[PDB]
Write a protein that binds this ligand. Sequence first.
Ligand code: SAM
Ligand code: ZN
Ligand code: ZN
Ligand code: ZN
Length: 214
Amino acid sequence: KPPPYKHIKANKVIGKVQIQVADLSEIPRCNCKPADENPCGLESECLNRMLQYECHPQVCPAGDRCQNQCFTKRLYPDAEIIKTERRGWGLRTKRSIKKGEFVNEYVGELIDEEECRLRIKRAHENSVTNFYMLTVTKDRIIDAGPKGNYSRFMNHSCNPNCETQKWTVNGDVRVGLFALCDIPAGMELTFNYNLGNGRTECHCGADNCSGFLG
Ligand SMILES: C[S@@+](CC[C@H](N)C(=O)[O-])C[C@H]1O[C@@H](n2cnc3c(N)ncnc32)[C@H](O)[C@@H]1O
Ligand SMILES: [Zn+2]
Ligand SMILES: [Zn+2]
Ligand SMILES: [Zn+2]
């Protein structure tokens, strides 16, 4: 292979965008216990999980047995870039992934709406057909094109195996990819994109494919 990009670990703010960090006092504390099985885990009633808030290890009553630290720990299932025939480069998981498990964080440059329009405009002028913009809110957009991680390679599907979720982590809203089903080793990882009047024909191959991305 793909053209170059900078492989980065965390989002990078651009221009007027600033990252909002919580004071420790502002991070919510859940009611989970060190003596629960799988504290703050997928099965649990964790109040932080419910609201898509990541626990902070200095706040959580389960301390370091807390299973709600996925963004901060940066443990992603090992993945691999693949070449497809009609959807460019994509991404496959090397190993099996369980339903609801954290797959990756969608990282990139954090830009505002005006910057995003400017990049889309420049891209169209240079006949670029690959876009990597994901809306966090109307005026906060992650562009994983110049800089990102492997999540930038996940193609669109009309019947995806992953979905995006917006999580609050230490006071900042971040975007994670999570498995919608049990995914076997070797499967291409996809999500349903959301995303001007530009449409790209879809080659996802799903039975419910609309024909366009998204
Ligand atoms: C975020 S990138 C995904 C990785 C990209 N395939 C690459 O080669 O770098 C998004 C671009 O991939 C293409 N793409 C992704 N899913 C597709 C699909 N299902 N059908 C056709 N093109 C797709 C479109 O060009 C889209 O703008
Ligand atoms: Zn908890
Ligand atoms: Zn916790
Ligand atoms: Zn499709």
